[PDB]
Design an enzyme around this catalytic site. Structure first.
Site, PDB file in Angstrom:
ATOM      1  N   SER C  88       1.297  -1.644  -0.693  1.00  0.00           N
ATOM      2  CA  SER C  88       0.054   0.369   0.412  1.00  0.00           C
ATOM      3  C   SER C  88       0.854   1.169   0.317  1.00  0.00           C
ATOM      4  O   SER C  88       0.092   2.866  -0.214  1.00  0.00           O
ATOM      5  CB  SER C  88      -1.334   0.021   1.470  1.00  0.00           C
ATOM      6  OG  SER C  88      -1.115   0.836   1.647  1.00  0.00           O
ATOM      7  N   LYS C 131      -6.928   5.339   7.731  1.00  0.00           N
ATOM      8  CA  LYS C 131      -6.120   5.361   7.601  1.00  0.00           C
ATOM      9  C   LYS C 131      -6.744   7.016   7.019  1.00  0.00           C
ATOM     10  O   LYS C 131      -6.501   8.105   6.874  1.00  0.00           O
ATOM     11  CB  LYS C 131      -5.700   5.119   5.673  1.00  0.00           C
ATOM     12  CG  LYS C 131      -4.886   3.988   5.245  1.00  0.00           C
ATOM     13  CD  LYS C 131      -4.841   3.418   4.466  1.00  0.00           C
ATOM     14  CE  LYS C 131      -3.836   2.289   4.122  1.00  0.00           C
ATOM     15  NZ  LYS C 131      -3.552   1.686   3.038  1.00  0.00           N
TER      16      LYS C 131
END
EC number: 3.4.21.53
Lengths: 180, 190, 181
Positions: C88, C131
């Site tokens: 990621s 996130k």
């Protein structure tokens, strides 16, 4: 350049700019180092030959460690066209194995043919030029890939009659002929 | 090259300068018994990296699928990606390379007359590729009976003349596991 | 707290929540890339993928600049991200390498996440809530997310989402134009 080949020397057949030649592929003392200096094309053709030769030696003689361990030197004479370079591929494998086993190749043998990682024999060109060169060098057994067959019988009878020809599909087949 | 492929060997469909070509990916040992990968095919760096992506994913996928099989972690393997595809198309050989690895590692051959194309992510996601018409043409010319494509190339494949597309069994995939199940059907489902 | 060239803020999904982590590229000591902030084989390859794509991408857009191909570079990617979230940080790394190569800092007030492929596709990642919340705890009001995570984002409470400038991306070039206007 030889009459009776020492270990690690195999007569391959080459397609040159003027005509056909008989070129001795040499191997002497894990790594492989290659001289006659070709461009990367020869070099990869050699490392696939090198890796097929290693696995083949693991499978044939689990015993033998020479290929997996030694720092070998490969010499391919300059003279072959760029496009013809990998058709030394079955000649390169044979030398490695001929060194590995300290065992000279059969006298009076010539071969041409590209080899794949798993050992399939791939067709090449210059069948005529190369078959003419084996005759002038006085070879009497010749080994050629199986889709080069037509190419062989398209040649004059003067060239071909007399000649013990084998058409192979996989390396293992060449290995038997070179090594009784 | 092969009509029946031994283990470690897979038909991959390439987009070339001239058109398309069915290409054979090959894998084998080069030392006996931590592992490594040697790669050949005259690769620029991007492609070298692409092969590493497939190696890493293949190692991850086997750890889970056959948690007993340490063959990729301990072995010294050679991978040959034969020449052909344009620079652009080179990543598309990823599932092929994944499949080739898993086939060597598991000692199971790939299902016959299978060919495939698709770029693989680090989590096995299959990305869309180019050259779909050239690639199906190559499959057809090479006698391929079953093509596996990325699901996102569905529209490229449907908008082809039907006689190209005629006679192929086609599976469109979103993840690698789908492409494992088409290649290794008598391996265990999940 | 102004990002100097070669520093990008990345969002990370950590096993207990969400974190913000500064990815850091510097000159160290045919170039080379040594990575620290150690992670498994997957996060390592993600680094390699980013380094290879950023050299291609710079070659393509700035023919003259040989920095990525000449310099010996240290990538630091701070610990915390789980394994599952390993690939990621892909676009974040790429963006640090490019920052540093153009000697150009990344814009202020920006965080990103997303896996990058060699063809430059941005791929979806997990942990989008955690996130998003990380960005927000850190002050960020402009964040860059993969296109296929659109769903994930809009499934969040409007309270989280409200006020965040968001960019949904498919290709890395989109990230470049945002980070270096």
């Amino acid at each position: 350049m030889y009459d009776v080949t020492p270990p690690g020397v195999v007569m391959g057949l080459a397609w040159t700019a003027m005509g056909g030649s008989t070129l001795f592929v040499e191997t002497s003392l894990g790594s492989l180092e290659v001289t006659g200096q070709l461009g990367e094309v020869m070099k990869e053709s050699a490392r696939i030959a090198y890796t097929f030769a290693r696995a083949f030696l693991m499978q044939h003689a689990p015993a033998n460690d020479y290929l997996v361990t030694s720092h070998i030197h490969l010499h391919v004479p300059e003279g072959a066209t760029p496009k013809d370079g990998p058709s030394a591929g079955c000649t390169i494998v044979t030398a490695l194995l001929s060194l590995a086993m300290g065992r000279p190749v059969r006298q009076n043998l010539a071969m041409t043919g590209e080899v794949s990682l798993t050992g399939k024999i791939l067709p090449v060109g210059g069948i005529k030029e190369k078959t003419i060169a084996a005759k002038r060098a006085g070879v009497t057994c010749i080994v050629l890939p199986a889709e080069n067959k037509k190419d062989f019988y398209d040649l004059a009878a003067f060239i071909t009659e007399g000649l013990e020809v084998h058409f192979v599909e996989h390396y293992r087949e060449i290995f038997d002929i070179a090594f009784p």
